[PDB]
Amino acid sequence: MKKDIHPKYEEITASCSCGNVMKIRSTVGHDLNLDVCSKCHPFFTGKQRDVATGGRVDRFNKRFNIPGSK
Amino acid sequence: AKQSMKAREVKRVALADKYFAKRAELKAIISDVNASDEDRWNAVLKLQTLPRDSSPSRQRNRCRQTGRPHGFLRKFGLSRIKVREAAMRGEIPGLKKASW
């Protein structure tokens, strides 16, 4: 520690308690613990029957009465 | 085309009408459109192996005279090459050269 090797050590020492908000701490970063694969795909998910996103109003059996006077 | 290709086409359409007009709505009720929360009740999936060569989709229309397997025109029921020969003699009524 000669005098002229100029550290920035007043700044590096300063501001020393940093929050989880301020600079995350060493209390953050193990949080997503493990690297996860699940090989029980859709259709292994107990779904032996399938259905689309939405359109679920008025479900009953009507045999193709959809044309307006054909 | 070969006389067998014309023969294949007659057997496919005669069975398309026989099976598939009836078994269209086994498809429709039970598998596709109205399977939606009426389940997928797994008869059809087994059933449809003997129908295999009777799908309306497994026909290509292909000319009720010359049997050309391409170039068809469903508006007439004929195909490119032979259609024009009938148009040339004036046996397709109202048909003549196009000028705009």
UniProtKB/Swiss-Prot annotation, chain A:
Binding positions (Zn(2+)): 16
Record SUPFAM superfamilies: L28p-like (SSF143800)
Keyword rRNA-binding: yes
Cited InterPro entries: Ribosomal_bL28/bL31-like_sf, Ribosomal_bL31, Ribosomal_bL31_A, Ribosomal_bL31_sf
GO CC annotations, alphabetized: cytoplasm; cytosol; cytosolic large ribosomal subunit
Residue numbers carrying N6-acetyllysine: 8
Assigned keywords, A-Z: Acetylation, Metal-binding, Ribonucleoprotein, Ribosomal protein, RNA-binding, rRNA-binding, Zinc
A matching Pfam family: Ribosomal_L31
UniProt cofactor note: Binds 1 zinc ion per subunit. Only 1 ligand appears to be Cys, the other are thought to be His and either backbone amides or solvent.
GO BP annotations listed: cytoplasmic translation; negative regulation of cytoplasmic translational initiation; translation; translational initiation
Gene Ontology terms, MF aspect: rRNA binding; structural constituent of ribosome; zinc ion binding
PTMs per UniProt: Proteolytically cleaved by protease VII to yield a peptide lacking residues 63-70. It is not clear if this is due to protein degradation or is a bona fide processing event in the strain used in PubMed:339950 and PubMed:10556732. In strains B, D10, MRE-600 and Q13 the only protein seen in PubMed:10556732 was full-length; the last 7 amino acids were sequenced only for strain MRE-600.
Top-level taxon: Bacteria
Cofactor(s) the protein requires to work: Zn(2+)
Family under the similarity heading: Belongs to the bacterial ribosomal protein bL31 family. Type A subfamily.
Subunit note: Part of the 50S ribosomal subunit.
Function, as annotated: Binds the 23S rRNA.
Protein name: Large ribosomal subunit protein bL31
Organism: Escherichia coli (strain K12)
From Swiss-Prot, chain B:
Keyword Ribonucleoprotein: yes
Domain of life: Bacteria
PROSITE patterns: RIBOSOMAL_S14
GO cellular component: cytoplasm; cytosolic small ribosomal subunit; small ribosomal subunit
Coiled-coil region list: none
One GO molecular-function entry: rRNA binding
GO biological process: cytoplasmic translation; ribosomal small subunit assembly; translation
Keyword annotations of the record: Ribonucleoprotein, Ribosomal protein
InterPro entries (UniProt xref): Ribosomal_uS14, Ribosomal_uS14_bac/plastid, Ribosomal_uS14_CS
Role of this protein: Binds 16S rRNA, required for the assembly of 30S particles and may also be responsible for determining the conformation of the 16S rRNA at the A site.
Protein family per UniProt: Belongs to the universal ribosomal protein uS14 family.
Oligomeric and partner information: Part of the 30S ribosomal subunit. Contacts proteins S3 and S10.
Protein name per the record: Small ribosomal subunit protein uS14
Species in which this protein is naturally found: Escherichia coli (strain K12)
Lineage: Bacteria, Pseudomonadati, Pseudomonadota, Gammaproteobacteria, Enterobacterales
